[PDB]
């Protein structure tokens, strides 16, 4: 029935709001949307277009600005002209020509939306209102920002985050001991921050060297899209912008970078940002009399940026008046004189070993006792100073509450986190095995020769040759000769694996040649499927092998090549560990050792040493095993004795057969040994340490954690959302889904997703054991993205379905009515936390009365039908009549349930913003660290969210049309 | 042109390990049916990614010419060992390894 | 599936192939034989049979579903499933009318 100079709007896309009929053939229509001027021109066939008409009663507005009330309508050879008051002048009898009316009909609340055609689906009906139930319960969820990190659940780092991520503007500096996940704490930190809305413009400052594994780090763990700025992106961006700096929220730099005009570091320090991170802040040398130029920079940067966070290192055994030249950093008012902090550590100091005694168990002398009395400035101390002493029945529990009153008396510890190995659980237990080897006489004659050619040349060199004798054999028997026939660790590796067909072994070798020759070698004669790890490949190449590796049972059984390492996810699964080689140093031992020593493995680690009788390997496995205790402990003495020790040794290495000497030496290393342990363990400030790990609130954390995710209806959501906008998932099987979009998605395209596909696993220990996969939970952004995308659309907002029940009447009418409640105020606020958008469901009858509670949704929805579009198009314009007489029958119910939720959520937020704001107050009474920004900044936040909740609304999202009949 | 290199996309790398790094299989490898008999990769073109991205690209590794295989694989059902192998080239720089 | 019965066979009035066309071929070739996409006038053209692949247009502009019935200012080719090609019909306008062989032979 088209005719030039209708009015049409589209049914999905009607942000272009109304079109106009201006030309028509055989096939098509075009209409022009003054909106934009435009024309569109539809086939006539399928018509997926919407006719626009008022009914007496609508209130419609003019081209001219003014509006009026229709009251009657002609239609005559298909055009429609509005006859009606108008409402601004009063004057009656105005007429309309359709093609005047304006372009500002927007969504209606869905009692409007009867009488647009074609309806929406009733499954994507019940994927809104699924949506807006799980996005409202979980948005008000206490762990948010916790759980879509690609972590292992470390009970120290969920702490921090915890802690940390929390605080406003927060100012710290991370000197946990090297290889305990600073970084991870770190970006968990980020992702807090980040998620919660408080910060939005980031800059993050890394040596260049690292900036990459920065840029994998936040994308694969923490699915973090960062942009690099380098001179020439900053040249670009200063010809599209004024400041360069604006185009994008979160920026990775260098230091070095930084420094390189005066007006980069103004443009810098003027970008306004919201967090800055520095990692390796040691690097920043600073004199008292002399501060270095690089210092300058970030004392700069620091200045005008309110959060700021600082990873550092605390190396050469030293104090943390080190770390006065960041402590100054931080808060330069509160720590502004060196000579106060090294009284201050000084005058501490027989506070923490009395500390030391009273927690190794010990008697403290009331002598002793009365510093610590001194300390903590009260009058009701005795009672509970003394029982904690005398060992009564309690001398636990009041030991606990005297570290608790140190932690809260300590001087820095809120602002300084130290994490050491020793005062954290859950490492394993490391157990070794020594296989003496016979020396083959191949090699033999290959080295005496190698010793006569050898005529000049450094010891240095001679030891580094005769340790690997495999690329000594290269250079007399010829390049490529088979070694790999006569060398008996090679027979002892394949046995063993053959033997122990049933586990998974890491094989650790020094360099990526030998590790080729040896798959080869276990190929072309046993058959061993073994990946290699090495330096030269790529990152996707490498991800594909320790996906096979990953395998339980049907992919490789063994692995590696070189030091390469630094997986942050490990390999929990795996327990053996084989060294091939040897290395020189003890530090490259400690890391390859490191690799597989983590928390959360699944047994103890055996490790099996292959080497051959009397040679460097001999010496060395003497050396480390009775003198250094290196394998089954990980004391970080190894370096000092090394370099006492390194020139002596030299000759103990080019020349094995001089045994005398070495026992002696031995002897001198368990004594250097028992010194550095000894210094160690009487430096430990387990004030500071306690108060780091969190406790048991922590542990309670973490285990809330484990428990919350197992939530299967987080994947049964999950694939209805993805399964209703069109993506395509194809089931690997082995708990890996492969999403690829189809070509019925719903959005040109998505912000996520690739044409090439996706894989996902919803297991957090998949995920550690597969990098290569997405870790889904309710934070990922997937899930976020298109969580606005539905709630944000108005698909699934109204549809119809009939109801078969004998024990009914004909025609009846149930109305389901979904309102939202919702407050309108800046997401820095975080109101979300408090008053998300919150639904009201509604169950109406002819009268009015509310069944919800007596009918459950998924029941009802499951034995309901939908109809045909044509058919049901008109059967709902048969109750447009009605349904505005049901509209206010809830009228009356809505303002009781909106005041009831409005009421209770607001007394949840006095009630928890006065307790949290007081415990800060009774910090500032008792610490000297809390600044007065942070109180003015939770009081005004207090304020400003009892403001933006008393005007709080409710509207009208989602509606369905129930109609009971017996056809 | 299409290649013949062993660099096959969103392959396990099972597939891979009974292959050569010319990419032909190994005398005397036994094989079922579906395994990849040979490598091929068909080339794709206007890739046109973002600056951005083919950073990324580059940081990777991915590969904008590939992303198609054009692989032969064994025939269904049928399962045996490969006794010969013979390569034909009309054109070629130089003689491949195999060759 | 409807309930139906009596098929029907008459002859074709030029008014009713008129009314089966969707548009006229006007040059014999099909493809560019360099890029495979269709001849803009050719026995095979997407404005008058349809797209070659599901809700996408020829040049590209617009390929998401949800546009059912816009036709691409660019390519005149409508956006749908590419089933509906194989329903579609042409014509050739003749300008000599010409005999109908079964009915002579
Ligand atoms: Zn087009």
Known sequence: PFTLGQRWISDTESELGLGTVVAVDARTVTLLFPSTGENRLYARSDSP?????????????????????????????????????????????????????????????????????????????????????????????????????????????????????????????????????????????????????????????????????????????????????????????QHDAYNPFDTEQLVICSLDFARRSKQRLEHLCEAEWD??????????????????????????????????????????????????????????????????????????????????????????????????????????????????????????????????????????????????????????????????????????????????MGARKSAEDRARDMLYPERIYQEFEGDNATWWNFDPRVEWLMGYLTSHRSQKVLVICAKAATALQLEQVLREREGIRAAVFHEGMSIIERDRAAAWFAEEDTGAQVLLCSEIGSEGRNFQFASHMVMFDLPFNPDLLEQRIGRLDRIGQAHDIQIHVPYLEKTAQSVLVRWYHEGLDAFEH???????????????????????????????????????????????????????????????????????????????????????????????????????????????????????????????????????????????????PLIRNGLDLILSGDTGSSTISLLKNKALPVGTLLVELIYVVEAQAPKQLQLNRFLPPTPVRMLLDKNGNNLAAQVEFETFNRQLNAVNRHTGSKLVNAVQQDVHAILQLGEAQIE??????????????????????????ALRAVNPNIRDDELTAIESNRQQVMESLDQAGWRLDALRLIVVTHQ | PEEITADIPNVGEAALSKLDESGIVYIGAEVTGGDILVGKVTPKGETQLTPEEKLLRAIFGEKASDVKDSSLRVPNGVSGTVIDVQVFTRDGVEKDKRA | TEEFDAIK?????????????????????????????????????????????????????????????????????????????????????????????????
């Not at chain 1, 501060?291 to 300058?296: D, F, G």
């Not at chain 1, 909106?898 to 959520?905: F, Q, T």
């Open chain 1, 49 to 237: 277009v919407t006719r626009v008409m008022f009914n007496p009663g609508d209130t419609i507005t003019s081209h001219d600005g003014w509006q009026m009330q229709v009251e009657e309508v002609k239609e005559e050879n298909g055009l429609l002209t509005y006859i009606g008051t108008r409402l601004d002048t009063e004057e009656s009898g105005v007429a309309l020509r359709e093609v005047f009316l304006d372009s500002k009909l927007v969504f209606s609340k869905p009692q409007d939306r009867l009488f647009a055609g074609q309806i929406d689906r009733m499954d994507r009906f019940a994927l809104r209102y699924r949506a807006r139930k799980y996005s409202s319960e979980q948005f008000r969820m206490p762990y948010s920002g916790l759980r879509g990190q690609r972590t292992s659940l470390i009970p120290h780092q969920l702490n921090i985050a915890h802690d940390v991520g929390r605080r406003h503007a927060p100012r710290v500096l991370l000197a946990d001991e090297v290889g305990l996940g600073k970084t991870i704490e770190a970006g968990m930190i980020l992702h807090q921050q980040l998620l919660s809305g408080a910060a939005e413009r980031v800059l993050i400052i890394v040596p260049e060297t690292l900036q990459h594994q920065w840029l994998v780090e936040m994308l694969r763990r923490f699915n973090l899209r960062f942009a690099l700025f380098d001179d020439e992106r900053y040249a670009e961006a």
């Open chain 3, 9 to 105: 066979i008459a002859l074709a009035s030029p008014d009713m192939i008129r009314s089966w066309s969707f548009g006229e071929v006007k040059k014999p070739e099909t493809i560019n034989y360099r890029t495979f996409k269709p001849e803009r006038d050719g026995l095979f053209c997407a404005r008058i049979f349809g797209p070659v692949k599901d809700y996408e247009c020829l040049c590209g502009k617009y390929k998401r579903l949800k546009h059912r019935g816009v036709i691409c200012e660019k390519c005149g080719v409508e956006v749908t499933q590419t089933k509906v090609r194989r329903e579609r019909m042409g014509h050739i306008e003749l300008a000599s009318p010409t005999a109908h062989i079964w009915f002579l032979k």
């Open chain 1, 634 to 780: 990980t004391c970080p003495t190894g370096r000092t004795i090394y370099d006492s020790v390194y020139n002596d040794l030299i000759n103990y290495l080019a020349s094995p057969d001089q045994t005398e000497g070495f026992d002696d030496l031995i002897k001198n290393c368990r004594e250097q040994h028992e010194a550095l342990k000894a210094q160690l363990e009487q430096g430990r400030d387990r004030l500071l340490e306690i108060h780091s790990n969190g406790g048991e609130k922590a542990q309670a954390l973490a285990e809330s954690i484990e428990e919350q995710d197992d939530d299967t209806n987080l994947i049964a959501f999950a694939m209805n959302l993805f399964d209703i906008i069109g993506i395509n998932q194809d089931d690997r099987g082995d708990n890996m889904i492969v999403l690829t979009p189809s070509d019925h998605m719903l959005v040109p395209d998505f912000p996520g997703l690739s044409e090439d596909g996706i894989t996902i696993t919803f297991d957090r220990e998949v995920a550690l054991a597969r990098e290569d996969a997405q870790f889904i939970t309710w934070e990922h």
């Open chain 1, 275 to 452: 967090l800055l991170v520095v990692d390796e802040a040691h690097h920043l040398v600073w004199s008292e009399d002399a501060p270095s130029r690089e210092y300058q920079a970030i004392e700069q940067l620091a200045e005008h940026v309110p959060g700021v966070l600082l990873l550092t290192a605390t190396p050469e055994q030293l104090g943390m008046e080190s770390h006065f030249a960041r402590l100054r950093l931080l808060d330069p008012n509160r720590f502004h004189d060196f000579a106060q902090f090294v009284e201050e550590q000084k005058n501490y100091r027989p506070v923490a070993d009395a500390v030391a005694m009273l927690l190794a168990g010990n008697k403290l002398s009331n002598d002793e006792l009365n510093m610590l009395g001194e300390m903590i400035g009260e009058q009701d101390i005795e009672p509970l100073l003394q029982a904690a002493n005398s060992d009564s029945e309690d001398a636990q529990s009041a030991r606990q509450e005297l570290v608790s009153m140190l932690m809260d008396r300590h001087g820095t510890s809120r602002v300084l986190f130290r994490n050491t190995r020793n005062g954290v659980k859950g490492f394993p237990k490391r157990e070794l095995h020594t296989i003496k080897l016979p020396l083959p006489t191949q090699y033999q004659t290959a080295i005496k020769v190698s010793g006569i």
């Open chain 1, 896 to 921: 009781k349930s909106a005041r009831a939720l409005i009421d209770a959520a607001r007394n949840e937020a006095d009630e928890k913003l006065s307790a949290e704001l007081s415990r800060l107050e």
